[model samples]
Target: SCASRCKGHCRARRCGYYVSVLYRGRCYCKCLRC
Candidate 1:
């Protein structure tokens, strides 16, 4: 769920790739290498 959401956001912005991380039981999205 989080992975898909994160990737979608990154793609929408035309990013090269995305990373989904979990911290404290929460998901975080990271866009990189644009």
Candidate 2:
């Protein structure tokens, strides 16, 4: 599954976890902290 260009960054503080998911035949991307 290919995501959009420049999907964007995460909202977590000092976090660099990149995330992407597919639902309803659509692509969603987000950032998370771990």
Candidate 3:
């Protein structure tokens, strides 16, 4: 459910592709390249 619901990154990264499902409202490492 979270994976499908991972919305835009409106927090730390400021980008949508950086958002994480496990972290919820937090950003993820995968976004490092972004």
Candidate 4:
């Protein structure tokens, strides 16, 4: 995770739960709510 990231941002960035560069341009079947 980045230095500026919190738990939710890290989770969101990795898990596609919210808008993120890591999971961008991909569709997820198992993404949880952010």
* Best candidate according to TM-score: 1
If scored against the real structure, what TM-score would every candidate get? Answer: 0.74, 0.37, 0.21, 0.26
Tens-digit per-residue lDDT, 1-34, candidate 1: 8889999999999999899987888998899877
C-alpha root-mean-square deviation, each candidate: 1.3, 4.4, 6.2, 8.3
Candidate 1 weakest lDDT stretch, 10 residues: 16-25
Instruction: Give the number of colliding residue pairs in candidate 4.
Output: 0
Which candidate leads the pack in lDDT?
A: 1
Comparing 1 with 4 on TM-score, the higher-scoring candidate is: 1
lDDT of 1: 0.90
Alpha-carbon local distance difference test for all models? 0.90, 0.56, 0.44, 0.43
Candidates 2 and 3, the one with greater lDDT: 2
Look at candidate 3 and tell me the lDDT of residue 16. Answer: 47
List clashing residue pairs in candidate 3: none
Reference-based lDDT, residue 13, model 3: 52
Candidate 3 — which residues are off by over 4 angstroms? 1-10, 19-28, 32-34
Model 4 is weakest, by summed lDDT over 10 consecutive residues, at: 19-28
lDDT of candidate 1 at residue 8, scale 0 to 100:
91
Off by over 4 Å in 4: 1-5, 15-34
Candidate 2 — which pairs collide?
Answer: none
